[PDB]
């Protein structure tokens, strides 16, 4: 029969095998080794599947070559600014934790050697820095620090100037000729909502900020940097208040009463800076990202089943009391393919409902209590919706009720399939597993003998939503009476595959015919011993319950027109 | 039987534990914790209940427990009866207890990761092996058996939260003669999950 | 990989590295940059208020020489802004609801920024109609399909709908102006991808006195922004509108006592 | 025996001071396929007197870890499920003869206990646990190799 065929592709097994093994390949990525936690720790590090990284963005990306300044207490404190102005800040690179502060502007003295200035604790074990390493082909500022002082109170603004028009280092021809150049004469702005490092508005500029005004500061910064041995120095060239912007963007005279009152006794000075420079080594001293692989394999056993027994006296064979063998065969075929199939489908649905909640997508390898190899290809998802046709419908007038109900049901199925596709990331997995073709999902519809007359649309273009293919199933068991089950399957292949909903483990059994002796009596007995077991692979399923259909058709349907609250009550 | 599913579906080759008072009653948990449940196989009417865990004592014998009056009338148990290749744990019963109130939930461990005896021989060529080690959890709407929703988890459930349990169960079976036992190795609360699918600390005030 | 054997499981072939590179570069970094662009424009300019041409000299990008800066955002409440006649016509009406809002925002942005004048100036002998790009998730893009209204993004306009799987843009539409005829860096396209290929290398590393072979792949590239224009549309509670009855939200407008 | 159910990471407990000088890292290593228990330390106590038996278990073939790839591609299983005997010549760890079982041993009886211990180990990760499941007095033998019941008054 069709119904069990759609939800479970038949798989024949040789009689000798007592179980078939499913081993799948999964590709893993995780960051560094676990190394030392006490002298080490049991590796609780989450080896997360790469297909998860197709969905979220935190799986990938690392910064492992940035030449971040690192403080050594009592050795190089004089290159960093006085920590009295700003306490130490901790940022993480790989496995290390260390303290960083903005560099002090060199004025007349010796500059800074960035390479020896950028010793993270890992690099120290990694061996002392030798000059066979070369700097990034492009370097630039990360953040620029100024102090707005008015009467003695100091406020800090971390102006993120990276990816400015004029903040990228350039090449020049003078003095040395591996030399890079940083010419920075540009207008920086302080937005009317811009917040300090602590996360608060400027109290000294609150009055200015109220009238809807912005401050523009013209800034001049220059310095040198060498890419051969990391020598480089920078100085504060010029920095002062220049002009005023408005909410609507016209310059406002500095001598105007509001501006003059707001800018009384305001002095702006530069304090620190930072560089975005990365060590572009030729062999790399970094682990970047590690790639690993495990193998997961599942067992599946095929039981034995109660035998189907015939009785017949054996010197003469009957065709009137017992017909040809077709009767036994069809009894076995129906008993197998319909009753057990519906039973296992409903049991599967209830198990998913119990374990997984409703409408919540759980991450990969997290909350599994089910079967399959699809969990390593897609996030699990289960959802159910009940349709009250009597109370949910839209109908101006009669002689259109059938179109009304079919429109509602088709909209509901569209919403279910669309939300499932969007949340599960199923189509991404389908694309990944199959190369050279990009099949669209194929949706199967199983239901009783009622809804097919209403799900087959007569007068509208859309039936399951154009862009989706469908196969309708009709079944007469009373467990499907007014019920619809939904899923994703692949009808183009006939082998166990992780993206198929289920596979029917089926071992052919040959009819045996030999005389048997029960209570010293003699007759010919035809014995059929079946064996099979309905398995599941995909932990995604959508079920819709529709009720009150008869009442809606027979009783007066009525536009639940929203009387909407325009006469004073709200 | 084309419409109803019970006309054709019958089992008469299934082993089911059977209870008879005061004569074989030490493979069954005392009925003061759960009343006996009535099940019918064939034409025999009899009561069944969950087999108890035993750690340091003797195990059970399935064949002597699963002998029904239909098999009584046919003759005493013989040695040529054989167990099938697939044996699985059907239900695992746990009780969540807090403040003296006992709520029991029947986990449908049938169709879990490794709730099925896998062929693993180390002593005999018949010894069936089970290693049921997985995280088996209770959802945010998972209703207790015997009706209604659980009350001891009402606060976590109303917040949309989910709890998880780690289960360590081991057991051995011999399909040759019916000797085997099952033991509980570790079963405790491990993690708590939010409605957004992100693990939160066990030290949170609400969770604690 | 331990350097005394070779595998196919514990050794994912070069294809795995290629896939990781493809993911990291093509998708995640680009999406991050686009959202950062949106946030920084929001902070600098504000909503719905443009600025005069050549009023920024330190704002990212170069195409501030041709078009007034403009950034705006809007929201759609499908729960309450939906009038329905028949449940067999509901879906088309929802699609028309979204499309009309798209069209009105496109027209407004075009009128304020004067894009047509810039397109006519920068190109001699051509009068090309503007091109609008549709960035959206994979749930919406089946909702820009109707022929219920002739306007799909509006007449005199060509459009392209693009999908993406990343969850951070859940039910969010991003729109802008691009140009499909160009293949060179020009101040009228949204941005260019400076991309230079690199090749991998495999060689024996002996680090902290250990033995192993490592395969290294160095990706080098960068994303850049040119056009300081973008429009963002949010769709909220789309599921609820389909889920429950949304009949005529008929406003009973008071020809009655006391009003 | 970790009956609390929280395991151990073997690559930690066995890092030698040479390795500390050598560095600090245990995560590119791999355990050989051969894993087996050296000794089971069982405490024979009665009324407050404790005796320790250093029993070499490595010479029973059921003490050898066997691979059962059913969870991951690198886990192996331990199932030591048999009976060990404490003979008359059983010696304590310090080297002295048995004292609590001296009464039976002077009567030439042999005491054997059934040991039911289970565990797991992973080579790649070093994660693993092994916990006692069932241990108990089992049966009693005489000189002639004839079983003597536990309920007999001479031994009960």
Residue numbers in the entry:
A (entry chain Y): 28 to 597
B (entry chain Z): 80 to 287
C (entry chain c): 339 to 597
D (entry chain D): 132 to 287
What does the publication say?
We observe the tail fibers are branched and rearranged dramatically upon cell surface attachment. In this study, we combine cryo-electron microscopy methods, protein structure prediction methods, molecular simulations, microbiological and machine learning approaches to explore the capsid, tail, and tail fibers of ϕKp24.
Each pentamer consists of five MCP monomers. Overall, the MCP interaction regions in a pentamer are similar to those seen in the hexamer. However, the increased curvature of the pentamer alters the relative orientation between the triangular body and hand regions, leading to differential stabilizing contacts. Specifically, in the pentamer MCP, residues R501 and R583 in the triangular body interact with residues D448 and E442, respectively, in the triangular body of the clockwise neighbor. The interactions with the clockwise hand region are reduced overall, involving residues K380 and R558 interacting with residues E220 and D163, respectively. In contrast to the hexamer arrangement, the C-terminal loops in the pentamer do not appear to form a large, well-defined pore in the density map. Instead, they are disordered, perhaps owing to this different arrangement to the reduced space and greater steric hindrance between the MCPs in this region.
